[model samples]
Target chain A: EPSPYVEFDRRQWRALRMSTPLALTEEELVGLRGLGEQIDLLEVEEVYLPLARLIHLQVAARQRLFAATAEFLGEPQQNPDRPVPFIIGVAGSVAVGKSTTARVLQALLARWDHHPRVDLVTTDGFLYPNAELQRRNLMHRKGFPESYNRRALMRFVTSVKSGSDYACAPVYSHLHYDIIPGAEQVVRHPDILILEGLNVLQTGPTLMVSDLFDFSLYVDARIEDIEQWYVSRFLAMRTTAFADPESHFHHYAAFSDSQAVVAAREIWRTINRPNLVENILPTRPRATLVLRKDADHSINRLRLRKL
Target chain B: EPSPYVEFDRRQWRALRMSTPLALTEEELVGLRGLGEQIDLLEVEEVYLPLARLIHLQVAARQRLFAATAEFLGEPQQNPDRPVPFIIGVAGSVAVGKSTTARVLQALLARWDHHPRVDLVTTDGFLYPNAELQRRNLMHRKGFPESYNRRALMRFVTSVKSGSDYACAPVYSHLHYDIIPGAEQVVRHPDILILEGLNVLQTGPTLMVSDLFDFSLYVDARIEDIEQWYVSRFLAMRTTAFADPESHFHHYAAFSDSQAVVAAREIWRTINRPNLVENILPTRPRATLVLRKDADHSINRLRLRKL
Candidate 1:
């Protein structure tokens, strides 16, 4: 069978970086990086810079096409009432550094003088509030698709896609492990929107979140690698998270390090692994681009959908 | 080219209302009817009773299939976490009696023993607030497709379709002709949901409200007939609306009867007619069934999709 995507190795893709300057300082890069996820200047220059340029080109072409088509539709004027923000969806397992990819893209994409306001919104805000999750009896399936307020997520994306000048999304607190009341993330006409989620590409019986995406990226790595990454992330965050009485994982504070590892491993095996296998991994092929990372969390290869 | 639908005159389709008893009194029937819209007890028995039975059967079949499929998938217990609400989208031009049809169906559908909880929602709440419309330079475009907060409407329907046990929608006030801030319409798990709107079936770049519909209906009539209906409705509404100082159309209260008629005609010509011709009429073919009414406000025939 013929593949729909063209595969590229690190060296080949890195060559496509094409004179795009590195846009971030080390400090900013550190801020963008998530716990236990690895990326540096070189990787940004090679991997993400080229990806942004390609996205830049794609967005530019679409803008031109929209203007021309509007003229063709007998409008001599550009409709200035609403602003169209190109949307990019990023999907992956919880520990695959999808958030870092989204944040880094937002930073880099905004650096382009052509479109300087890029917004990154994670899908966590669309997850049901802790109380709602408890009521649905889906507390354990936190990152699973059912745990999400799929309709709310779809609505937020749809509003942006409709070219509405303003939209708002509920805010989620990682410390509280729930949606924050009376707090919202308001999006006002960004040039590009990077939506990151564990299962943004998951489809339903009707139109889904992915259908509104102009482009989609899947962060990929081996199951074993992701599992280890999850454990490492849990270990690194335990001290800080435990110190916060409000943290959802506050109960883990008194546990011994070894017990923490056991808990992390059990959590991965019981919840995340099942979700990845049953829900997340299967959506990888639906991505416009696949960033295949190695065990050390470096992108070694990439896949771009040819069609 | 052959049409995708089978046409049925009123009596022919009325025969199919088999075995479903007329469950409403004349008092209930009058309550369901809207201003200048006509539906009687006979219409209930002939038109709506059959439709409810058909929807009931569709819901029952789906319930059985879901249960049987769950067993096949190794689940012995029915998934009780979410209750899937069957959505029926009702669309029509204003004054075309769409509201009457939806309200009647909601009344009759609730009488069914199998699915007693039938809830109705109007998409007017999903219209952009008057301030938003003024900001977008779309105050004149109310009831047109672009006048809506489309994403919100789609989200409301999607939540119901996802079988979420509960969902909430913003409320719209006819008196103020705006979305009421902080006022929301909550929909608990209904066995059936009737979503009525001027453009409920309209689609855009992504998934839309109609995509969630298990079935849909379009109430149709001649443009001229609807115009007269609009004029009559306006005349009848003037006295009450003028009494409410907050009414959006309160200015019309001071006009002479002749001036009010002229104002109503101009409104129809400029806004409602154009929407009907450009947006509502084009979506007629996409409906699962259409109620074609005569000038006298009686449904004369119907068209049901053959597939």
Candidate 2:
């Protein structure tokens, strides 16, 4: 009569390693040999799916709790039937593959039974186009927190939570390097919304302060491993995707082999690595769950914060 | 004659021992300070005047070198008829008193015998309003580089450097916490323009990168001292300025003593300190000159990166 349970940290936990394979369907697995050999799909299926399901439940519960709390507190005393938003914040360092995780989750959760009206939002859309940062002399500190419009971000979250029927987010054009004026992503009434960023877990530690997320996740890896991965990804992009004329990073496509590698390494050491150490890493323990990656760029383990 | 100079080490610096007075007339000082301290005129005339003079000389020398370099390159790419605007980038951690420094320098340089049309631009103007970031779910990572519109910023800088007669930068409203659409600060042609921010000193080491500055100054301070100063400033602001209904931080005015203090500490430890150490400090050695602050919030030493 007892429900089945698994202790994740125990040796027997490998049983949760997902016997049915991780994510990509067999029909879609053509020529993706390196990725298949590298990453464990079983972990994606068992761990991520279960986690996403839990998040779906928690999001709904929190939305109800917030609505009730607001009503109890006489929030908007006149209009009492407002619905509070369910926000899920996703955070990770560069190249730990948080983007893909967010995307994959967005796809899965949209189909998940509990939360069919799921939405995914990335912080990149809020970035002041590359041109603006350069003009402000903030190009070098591009990903650092001071480079963001904190107040603006807070306002958007407040609007969404206030249950606005048509909430529009500013669009960032990576190629042009600024917010495209008319471009906006609209989110209607959704059961769940995922906010993903390099520092999304950085919550102000106080009540009466803005605590936007109902739940948060930190995608993480060893610092050295992340650095290596960042550099490797940069190198890969330079040789492959960056060659396209439309690519924002196309300038690096023509670099000689050694030059490209050096540039990648330098950017990793100067920007990405420092960002991880100072910003992302510090916020890891704050996340409700941590998806820790191994050197091979695969999620080897998970560390959930004790509630 | 050898110049008498002071070297700053963490243990020896004391802010109270050194003071730079606002050089404005007593009436002007009173007007500028509003309810704050009276003018420290002696420090302005003796300390900052010399610094301004040095910057003026650097500007002239930079013009000559640039002209010669253009001739050597056999092309007049950046407006031959108009003198390139001498950009002086001023960067420092928050509350290292950079606003004071920029204001003083603007006033001083504006009064210079050779360059009377000096202008000053704070990076604060270009920050996208708070509403936008909130909509995008990036409110938490506000100060990071990802927050600003880099492309727009870069274009503004490029236009200014390219001798645009009238260039406009976006205006940010601190009280409302958003960018006022269609609001811009018009910048007329000036002999000298000072751009101040947390990351202004950075220049890409990559080949042919846009190196817009004629000179750069980084206001320096020990991390511990900055942390204390920022916390104290926040506490002071909470009791005084933050109480105003029009103030953007009015919400914190009613915060309990412990709440206010914790907010200040959290902001400094997580946002300001990390930003300063990871983004701002790395570019300290890149400054054309460094105004090193001692404890107690005053510059006791200067280190000019020898040309």
After best superposition, candidate 1 residue B295: deviation in angstroms? 20
Question: For residues A80-199, what per-residue lDDT tens digits would candidate 1 score against the true structure?
Answer: 444457889999998999989998988898887664678889989998988898999999999999999887887788777666677899999998888999999999877788899999
lDDT of 1 at A25: 98
RMSD of each: 21.4, 27.2
Q: TM-score of B chain for each model?
A: 0.93, 0.83
Q: How far in Å is the alpha carbon of B287 misplaced in model 1?
A: 14
Q: State in Å the error of residue A236, model 2.
A: 28
Q: Which stretches in model 2 have alpha-carbon errors above 4 Å? A: A1-307, B1-23, B30-39, B73-81, B203-210
Interface RMSD of each: 19.5, 29.9
Query: In candidate 2, what are the lDDT values of residues A152-265, reduced to their tens digit?
Result: 565566556556675778887766556788898998866667888886665331110024566677777788887777667666776567867987788988887688779988
Q: What is the TM-score of each candidate against the true structure?
A: 0.51, 0.46
